[PDB]
């Protein structure tokens, strides 16, 4: 009856953008590690097999829900350097320069991935860091075959930045061209970094040799990340943002992410409509959702930011009465131009 | 960004979304560490009212500041049914993460699609500014004409996201789905 079939398993399962990383996660589960152990192992593996986004030099979020229902969020989003300033990306005329925030050394925030994975592993995992890093270490040391996904990304997106930096080019470029499908990608330097983290712990990244390498890279090229920045970084466990949609409870990331709040806000709006009745791919369902989305993004532009710096009115934004006031504005037969939509007035729902 | 999901034999679940921001980030490796550096700073509002790479805008709340965490759209998500973990999902896509995940939830709850069906279904997106109803290939010409008649400004663009999800059955059985939009990915278990 179905055209599309899910993969099935009776014990454990891992879903990721990379076959190798997924298999690393499954093997960890088979060895007895829990979901967190496997998640960290996958995260480290992707930092090697999916350099496009898997990383040690970036940041992210983790949602954890124990078998007992305990649900929590881990914020390991990058922190702007201590020397960062409000107008740092403006040119002499006062206009933002996308080059500065996307391709220069000023575009980087202090990495939180290593801190986040260790916070989760130490509190909710069962295996030592060395054990979950080992798979990634071997992949970096011995290398892996470049597949279609990686080859395509290196050629398309990589060409715009990788060959412009000596150290990056030495790793991802070959014979003057991006590595091709079938080639073997060995990352010896990354392997060393992984080995040191495995042996010395997360401090290796934030206070050790890696920290020194990051600080120097920045200092020599006009970047701002310093050793003080790295030593001051910290992942933060925060309460998830959640809601109730037709009896289902939805949990996602809280500020510094806008995801949880707007997903809940929009679901709150949609709850006022008989979505099932309209059905997937119907003009009515798409109309209602497109309109609801407008109000959420308008609110996003005004009320969302790092909660440690600004008070986010999350209660009001996820308030069902507020959602109802928005739903009553949606005309299923007439879209409202964005020019007529502004951030909502939250006072009545504070 | 890349997202991955995990559910173990005991029923514990984890959803992780992490990133360098754009593909390969700055493309800058940190010295001899072999580690690529992120360009997450573009997620801050550089100037009130001016859009960033994803067309998102801001003001004081998301303005750049020392030690501040730039606003994200990353949404690792878990939906609970009958008191138990039911759907574990998430996806990359910058500003589109919110709507892609939203659609996974709506597809699962309102349309009763299995995890693979919800994953392979086409996606649409509207982020207020720019004022356009972005759509992927896959929607009926009849439906798109009705949307235009309603006043929507339909814009056919590149595929959106890469959901990597796991749905948990009432008996603990696991169902998973990788995204057709991403080649070489995998959902596997035991």
UniProtKB/Swiss-Prot annotation, chain A:
Superkingdom of source: Bacteria
Residues the record lists as binding L-glutamate: 77
Record's protein name: Glutathione hydrolase large chain
Gene: ggt
Full-protein residues shown: 38 to 387 of 580
Curated annotation (Swiss-Prot), chain B:
Impact noted for substituting residue 1 to A: Abolishes autocatalytic cleavage, loss of enzymatic activity
Effect of residue 123 to A: Not processed into its subunits, loss of enzymatic activity
Catalytic residues of the enzyme: 1
Outcome of substituting residue 181 to G: Not processed into its subunits, loss of enzymatic activity
Binding site for L-glutamate: 19, 21, 40, 43, 72-73, 93-94
Stretches the record annotates as Disordered: 171-190
Descriptive protein name: Glutathione hydrolase small chain
Naturally occurring in which organism (per UniProt): Escherichia coli (strain K12)
